[PDB]
Symmetry: D2
Subunit: 490 residues, 4 copies
Amino acid sequence: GASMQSAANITLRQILEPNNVNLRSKKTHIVCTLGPACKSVETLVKLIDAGMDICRFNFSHGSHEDHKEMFNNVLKAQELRPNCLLGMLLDTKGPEIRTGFLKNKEVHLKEGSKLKLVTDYEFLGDETCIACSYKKLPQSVKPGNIILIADGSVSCKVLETHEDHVITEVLNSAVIGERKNMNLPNVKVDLPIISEKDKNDILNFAIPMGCNFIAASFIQSADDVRLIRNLLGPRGRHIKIIPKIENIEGIIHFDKILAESDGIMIARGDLGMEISPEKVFLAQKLMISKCNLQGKPIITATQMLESMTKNPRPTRAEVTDVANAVLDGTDCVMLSGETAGGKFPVEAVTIMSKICLEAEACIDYKLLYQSLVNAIETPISVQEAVARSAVETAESIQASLIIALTETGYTARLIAKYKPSCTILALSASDSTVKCLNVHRGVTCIKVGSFQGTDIVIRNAIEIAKQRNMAKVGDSVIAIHNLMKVVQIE
Amino acid sequence: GASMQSAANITLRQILEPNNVNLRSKKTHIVCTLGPACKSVETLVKLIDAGMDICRFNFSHGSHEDHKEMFNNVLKAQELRPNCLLGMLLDTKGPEIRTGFLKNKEVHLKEGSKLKLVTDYEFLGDETCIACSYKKLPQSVKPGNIILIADGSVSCKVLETHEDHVITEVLNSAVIGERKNMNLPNVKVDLPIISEKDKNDILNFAIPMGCNFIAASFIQSADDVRLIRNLLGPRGRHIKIIPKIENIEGIIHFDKILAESDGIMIARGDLGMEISPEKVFLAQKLMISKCNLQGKPIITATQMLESMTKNPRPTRAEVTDVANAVLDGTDCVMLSGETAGGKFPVEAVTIMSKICLEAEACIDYKLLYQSLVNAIETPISVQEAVARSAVETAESIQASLIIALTETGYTARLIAKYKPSCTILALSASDSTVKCLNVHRGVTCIKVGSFQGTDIVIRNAIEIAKQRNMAKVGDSVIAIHNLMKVVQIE
Amino acid sequence: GASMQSAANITLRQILEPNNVNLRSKKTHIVCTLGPACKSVETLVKLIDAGMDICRFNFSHGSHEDHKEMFNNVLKAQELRPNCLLGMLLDTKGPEIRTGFLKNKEVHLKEGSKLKLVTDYEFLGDETCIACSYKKLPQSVKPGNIILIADGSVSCKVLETHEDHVITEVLNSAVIGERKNMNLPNVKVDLPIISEKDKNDILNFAIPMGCNFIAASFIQSADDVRLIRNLLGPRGRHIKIIPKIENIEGIIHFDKILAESDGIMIARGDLGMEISPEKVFLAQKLMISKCNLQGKPIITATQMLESMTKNPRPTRAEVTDVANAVLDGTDCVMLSGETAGGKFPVEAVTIMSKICLEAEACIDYKLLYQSLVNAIETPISVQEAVARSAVETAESIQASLIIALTETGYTARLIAKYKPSCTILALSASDSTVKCLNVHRGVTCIKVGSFQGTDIVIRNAIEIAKQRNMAKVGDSVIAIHNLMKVVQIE
Amino acid sequence: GASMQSAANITLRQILEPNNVNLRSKKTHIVCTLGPACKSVETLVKLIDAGMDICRFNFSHGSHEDHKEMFNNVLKAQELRPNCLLGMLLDTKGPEIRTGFLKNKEVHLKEGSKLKLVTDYEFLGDETCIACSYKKLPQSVKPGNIILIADGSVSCKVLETHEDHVITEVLNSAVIGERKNMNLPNVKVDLPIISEKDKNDILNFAIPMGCNFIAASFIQSADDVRLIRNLLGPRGRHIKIIPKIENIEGIIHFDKILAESDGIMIARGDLGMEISPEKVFLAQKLMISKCNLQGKPIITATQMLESMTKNPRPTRAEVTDVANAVLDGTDCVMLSGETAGGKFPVEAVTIMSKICLEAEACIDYKLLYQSLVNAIETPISVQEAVARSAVETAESIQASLIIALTETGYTARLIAKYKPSCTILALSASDSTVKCLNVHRGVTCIKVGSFQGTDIVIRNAIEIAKQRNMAKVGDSVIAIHNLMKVVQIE
Ligand SMILES: Nc1ncnc2c1ncn2[C@@H]1O[C@H](COP(=O)(O)OP(=O)(O)OP(=O)(O)O)[C@@H](O)[C@H]1O
Ligand SMILES: Nc1ncnc2c1ncn2[C@@H]1O[C@H](COP(=O)(O)OP(=O)(O)OP(=O)(O)O)[C@@H](O)[C@H]1O
Ligand SMILES: O=C([O-])C(=O)[O-]
Ligand SMILES: O=C([O-])C(=O)[O-]
Ligand SMILES: O=C([O-])C(=O)[O-]
Ligand SMILES: O=C([O-])C(=O)[O-]
Ligand SMILES: [K+]
Ligand SMILES: [Mg+2]
C-alpha cells in the first residue's frame, strides 16, 4: 500500500507560449536503448544534443562484439560533447523466453494464420514457423492458451500441442524481428535468475568495459540482488544494481528488493504480459511512490513513445504517459525500440525532453517539498538535514543551483530526494560517481581534480555554470559540503 | 490558471487480485464512435455489455443513409438491452480540411516517396496523388512546411507548390483510408463554424432522429455556441451542446465557451495537430479541472487506445492515458477508430471499462469531496447544499446508492458534481433527461412510467436496483427530493 | 493524551463596534451556584436576563430546607420568564474535608498569626481556632506541611501536631466564611465516594425535587459513576450524572470515567489544591478535547471571575480565562462564589455572557467542523450522519436555526457535537429532556405537547422563533427527524 | 484582521509528573516591575533565580533617586549572577490622569461611600477626598459617569460636578495607595504624548543610566514613535522604543505604530479601562498574531497574577492567562504590582516561570514553523532564508542550540521570528545588543570580545554552553554567521 502524485499549476501562457529552453537543462533523465538505428557516432552526438543521459545495452540482443563497438562509439561521441558524462547500463538476458532468428530478419504475421512454434533454437524461421528459446514449451502450454509475443504486440492462440512443437493461430497482424520476448500463461518458468550467459555478460563485459549499472531482468527477491552483488565481487564494487520489476514475485517482494537495490526499473513490457494490462498503472504509481519516499532512483520503462518506431510524432496517450510518469515522480523515463531499431530515434529523444520540460514546469515545488518532509520520519541524519536545508533555502531565495561537493555522490543523492526546483551540480573527482549520479532526477555532474581546493572547485563550477547558461550574474547558488552557504554569482 | 489530480490509494491487493465486478458498474462513461466495424446489432449488443454509454455519429464520415441504418440498429440493440439507455451524439463536420476519396478506399503511403495533393475533391486518389477539400491549399502552404494527416500519424514535407496542386515528401510509412483530417501549418482557415452542410445534419438528422448531444467541431467562441442554440430552436430545446476544443481559439476563449456550453469535448487529435504535441497534456489537465469546478461534464477524446485498431490489447502508454484521464476528473472517455474502423472494437471497450474500474477504485473519495468543497464558494443554493450533503452522508455511512428524483436532471447533475463513491440513480419520466445524464460521471437512469407517490417511486427503484445487483438487502440508500433521507433496503 | 484549540478570526470592528445582541442568544451556557446573594425571585429573574441556564445547588453548604426554598424560588422566577427552562444541578458533599462554623460568620485571618485547628466539628470558631471535619487530621499531617483552604486562597503551615488538634501559621491574610474546603498534603482521605449523607441528598432531594443532574464530587473511577447510577435507580433514570474531576485519580481514570458519565465538570478549585496550580491548565485543555471528541458536554468551573465577589468588574486574567474556555471548546462556564455569596452576582453573569458572545464571534465554524469530522472515524451511524449533514447544510446556506424534534434528546446531542454556527432548537414533549439538554453548547429547548404532529410542531417552533427574534422571514431553517429538510420562513 | 493560536500536545505524563527543571531554561521572558517589595539586592538575586529577564522602572511612581538606587541595586545583584544579563526598561508617565498623594499613603475606599475628587494635586488625601492630575476633570464628567481607578479595581459613579471638585459614589470596597491610574468616560484627554517630565526622564535617566528600552505610555501614532526616536538622538540610538497600546487610537493605528517600533507592550490595565473588558482578549490575540507575523517582540502585561499581591499562590484564571499568552505567541509576560508592592514577589516570578515552562512543553514546533512559513510570502532575503533553515535543521536533527554570531542582534531576531524548540544562543561584542535581545522569546546572550575570530568565539560559546548545561557532549548545534554550519559537541 501507498498514496500519490505531485500538484500541478497550468496557465494559458504555458499552453500557448513556446518553451525555448535547452533540452539538456531538464530534470528527468533519459535512458536510451542502443542498437542499429543509433550505432553511428554521428547519431550518438545527436542523441546527446536531444537529451540522452544513460545508455542501455540490451544483452538479450546483438553480440558482445557489436555491443563493444556501440560502447566505443559512445566514448567517441563523449569526446565531441565534453560537457556530457553518460552512464552505461548493461541490461541482462535473465530467465527470458524468446522467439528465434528469421530468414529475412522480419516476418509479417497475419491475423487468422497458423504459426508453428518449434524448440529448435538454431532454426531460421518465417511467418509460417518460428522457434522458441524454451525447450519445455510443448509440455508447458495447453490448447486455448494465449502466448504473448513482443510486449504483447502479438497474441497467439494454442491450437494443438505436440512432442517438439506447438501449432498456434495468430490473433492479430504484426511485423516482428528476431529474438522477441514471449510470455507463456500461468507457466512456472524453470530458469535460473543468473545463467552462465548472464555470468559471462557481467564478468566479461560489464566489469571490463566499465558499466555503471546492471539492470537485472526478472528479479524476484532481495536474495537475487545479493547474488549479483556477490557475482560482481571486489572489481564491480562501484557497479549499481537496478533490479527490473517484470513479474508477480517482483511486485510481492518489492519493499525488500528496493531495500537491497541501488534503484529500480519498472519493466512494464514483460510486466504487462504477466499481469492484466489495466493492473500495470497501479504497479507503476505504487513503485514510484515507494522509491520517492526511500530516496531511491526509479526508471519508468517500455512503450512510452511506441508509435515513434514508425512515426516522427507520438500519439496523444504517449505524450500523457511521459508527462504523468514525470508528475508521478519518476527520476528517469526510457526509450527502447524507439531508439534501438526505430525510424526516428532523435525525434523520439527530442519530444521526450520537451514533454519532461513541460511537466516539470508545472510541478508545485513548494508543495512537493512539504509532502516529502511530512512523509519522512524525523530525527534524520545531519547530512540529510543539511541536504534538505539546501532545497528549502534554494526555493525560498529562487537560487539557480545547488552545488554539492561529493566523492561518493551521497550528498547529491540526499539533495535529489527532496526534488529541488533548480539543478543540482554534483562535483566529484571519481569517474564512477559522476556517471552513477545520472540515474537521479535533476543531478548534473562535473568531474573535478582529485585533490583540489573547495573554493576553487566551486568557482570553476560557477564558471562552467555561466558557460552552460545554467546561472547568470546576480543569481544565488547554494554550496554544500557539515555546512551550507549562499554565494552570489559575479 | 488551475491546480489538480485526485489522490490514489494503491494496495498489493488491487494489483494482484482479479476485479470480477460488472463492466456497466463503472462511474466513468464511454463514448463509442460507430462505423463499419460495429454496424451490426450483434456487435452493438456486445459493446453495450462491454460498457458503452453514449453513441457517437461522425458526420465527417459515412452518409445520412449509413447513419440512419446505424441509428436504427442501436434502437434495435436497446430493445435487447432494456436496462441500458444510450445517449446519441451527432459530431459535426465543422470548418474541416480533409483528404479526398481513394480508388481502392485505402492507400499504403511509404516513407521517402512523393505525394501530389490536388484541389479537385472528385479525384479518386492512390499512393501518389490525393485530393484536398481546401481549394486554397497551394496558396496556403510553402516549401518546407509539414502537412499533418490523420491526427498527425502521417507527416508530409512540402517540396514544391504549384497553382492547382502541391508536391510533398511522405516523411513516414502509413496506411490511410478516405477523408482523413488535415492540419495546414500556421494557416488561418477561411471557413464558417456552422456551414449549410452542418445545418442540414442538425436540422434533418439530429432533431428528427432524437440526438441528445451536438458535439460541435472547432468551436472558437461563446457566440458560436449561442449560434447553435438559436439554430436548434424550440424543436431541439432538450438537445445538449458539447463544444469540441481543438484549436488555439477554443483554448483562449475556454472559460466563456464553458459558460455557454452543456459540457466539453477535449478533441486531442486536431488540437495535437494545431499546438505542439507536448502541450496537449497541459490543455487536458486544465480543462478537466475547470469543468470539474463548474460541474460541467467533460469527454477526453482521441488516441486513448489507438494501437487497438490492429491489436486485441493496448500499449502501456494507452492504459495510463485512460487511467490518468479518470484520476484527472474526466466524466467520459472516448473511442474513435478503435470502435468505428478497428479490428477489435469489443475488446477495446472492455479494457477501457476495466481501466476505469481500476482507476476509480484508487480515488480517496473523502479527500476528493473535501477538495471540491474547498474550491467552491459558500453560500451556494439550498439545492446544491442538499446534493452536497447526500454525497457526504453517502460516504459517512457507506451507502450503496444516491436516488435522485428529477424531471430535468438538475438534481442528478448537482450530486454528480460532488463525485460520490457510490452510483447516482437518476429517476425521471423524461426520455431526453434519461439519455442526457449519460454524460455525467456515475449517473445511471431509470425511466419512470408515472409521477405517483414519492415512496412508491423510491421502492420500485430499489427493487430494480436489487435485480440489477447495484444494491443488496441491508444496505443504506440516500433519497434526495428540498430534502434528503436515508433508507434501509428490505 | 490529545491536541487542540479552535480557529479565531479577529477584525478591528469586533474590538471597536459594540455587541448590542440579547445575552440569552449565546451558545455557551452558564451554570450559576445559588446562595444567599441570589435567593430572591427578583434577583433570579435578573440572573435569567443576564444569561443563567443551569442552577447549582451545593449540598456542602446550606441545608435541605434552604435548598428547597431556593429551588421553589427558581420555579417562581421561571413563571415570569416562560421562554427560559433551567436545568437543576445537585452538587454532592462527597469525601470532603471542611472548615467549621464560626461565632461571627466570618474570620479575618492575618499573615503570621497562629491558627489552632480542632476536630470538634460542633465548635463555633474564630481567628485563633477553627474546627476541621476530618477527625484523623492531627495524625494525617506533620510539621512543615501546607494545609490549603478555600481553593488555596488561604495557606497554613503546620507548626505542631497533638492528639486532638494542630497548631498552624497563617501564611497570608484572607477573610473566610464557614465550611470552606480544605486540602491536606499527601493524605489519601479515608472517606467514601458516596456517604449516607450523599445518599440522602440524592434520594431525598434530587429525586423528589426533580433535579436534572448530579455533579458528583471527587469521582475516582467508572465504578463510582455506576454506584451513583444504581443508587438513582428506576426513579432517577432521567437524572444525568456529571462526575467532577478534582483529584489525581479522576485524571488518571478520565477516559473510563468519561465513558460512563453524561458529561464532565472540571472542578478546578480542589484539583488546583491537589495538583500544582501550573498543571491545571493542561488538565483543562485535555479534558475539553476528549469531551469534544466524544460529544460529551463539559463544564469549566471555579475562580473564572473570582475578583467579582468584591468588584463590579473582573481582572484582565479573568476575561481571558472565560474567553479561552469557550475557544477551548467548553459547553458551559460556571460561577460559584460570584453568584452564591458575592456582592455583584448580576454583573458577574452579565459580563460572562458578554465574553462568551465575543469569543463565539471569533470562531471559524467551517474550520471547526472540518477538524471534528477529521478526528471522528468513519463509518458513523445513519443518525450521527444526518446530524453531521444538518450542521454542514446550515453553514453552507447560512441557516438561522437547526430544528431537531427529539424525545430523549439524542438527536440534539448529535448535532451539538458538530458545533453549528447557528442555534439548535430542540422540540420535546419530555420535561426532563427540555431541561437536561441545557448542558449542551448551543441548544435551546421548547416543550411541545405529546399528541402534536411533526408539521404542527415545526410550524409552532418557527412561530416561536420569529417571536423570540431567533429567525426572521426569508431565512432558511434545517429540520431533522432519518431525514433532513430545508424550510423557508414565510 | 488576523487568524491564530499555537497547537498544544498534552499527555497525562505532563500533568502528573513533576517538572523540577531550572526556571531560567524557559523561552518566554519575564518583565518585572521593580518597587519597594523588591528593593534589596538579596530579593533581586532571588528574582533572577526565579526567572526575571527585564527590569521595569515605572516613572509614574517613586523618585528619580529611588529609581537610581534601585538601578544600582540591580547592577549589584547582576554581580552575584554573572551568567544573567538583564534588560533595563523605562516606563514613561505619558498623557496620564492619576489619583493624588495621601496623608496615610494608603486608604480603604468602602462601597456606597461618598468620595470627593479635587483638582489641586498638592493635596494629601484620605478616604473622603482624593486629588486628580487633570484640572479639566469637572469640565469633563457628568452625573452618572463611571470614573475608573487602578485598572478599574475601583468604580466611581458621579453624583454631582462643581468647579474645583466632583462628588462620586465608591461603587465597591478597595484599599488603594498613591498615584493610581484614572480613566474618564468618553473624554478626549488634552495632554501631550511626551511631556517635559517625560523628556527629562528619557534624557537624564534612560540615556545616562543606560536603559535598553522605553515603554512609552499611551502611543497613538507612528508620529509619536518618530518623535521619541528624534529625542533619543544618536546618543540613545541603541535604545528600543516599545510603544504601549492602551487606547482606541493605538488599536486603530497599530499597524503603522508596529511598523515604526522595536516591539509592542499590550498595556491591558489602561486598555481594559478605555474599551469594554470583554473586548481586551480580542485586542491581545490580534496584536500577538500581527507581531509574530512581523517577527517584532510583544510583551503581555497587567493583572496576570494580580491575586498574588496578597496570596503565595494564584487563582485558576491567572494560571490560564499566563499559559494562554505563551500559547498565543507572546515573547514576554509582565509583573506589575505582584513584584513592585506585593507580599509575595519571588513566588509570583517562580509560578510565572513554572507556567511558561509548562505551556512551552505542549507547543508543536514542527507545526508552528510550518504555519509561520505559510503565513510569510516568498521570495525572502538570503539572511531570512538561512535563519529559517537554521530553525528547520535544528528541529530535524534535535539540535541543542542555534549559535548566532551577531553585532546588532539582526541574525538572532531573524531566527527568533521562526520560534525554534531549542535555545538561540546570541553572541555579540556589543553590550546594548546583549541586553536588548532579552525581549525576544527563547534568546540567551553571551557577551564576547570584539577582536576575536568567529571560530574562537564559537568554541568559547560551546565551552560556556557546556558549563551552563545548555549543550553537552554528543549534541549537534547550529552555528549561523551567509552560512549555516552543524557542529558536534566533543
Ligand atoms: N461513420 C463512419 N463510417 C466510416 N468510417 C468511419 C466512420 N466514423 C469513423 N470512421 C473511420 O474511423 C476513423 C476515426 O474516426 P473519427 O470519428 O475519430 O474521425 P476523424 O477522421 O479522426 O475526425 P475527427 O477529428 O472529427 O474525429 C476515421 O478516419 C474513419 O476512417
Ligand atoms: N447554598 C449556599 N449557602 C451559603 N453559602 C453558599 C452556598 N453555596 C455556596 N456558598 C458560598 O459560596 C462559596 C463558593 O461556593 P462553592 O459552591 O464553590 O463551594 P465550595 O466551598 O468552593 O465547594 P466546592 O469545592 O464544592 O465548590 C462557598 O464556600 C460559600 O461561602
Ligand atoms: O525489460 C524491459 O524493459 C521490459 O520488459 O519492459
Ligand atoms: O475531432 C476529434 O475528436 C479530434 O480532433 O480529436
Ligand atoms: O467543586 C468545585 O467546583 C471545585 O472544587 O472547583
Ligand atoms: O501601563 C500599563 O502597563 C497598563 O495600563 O496595563
Ligand atoms: K507609566
Ligand atoms: Mg497603563
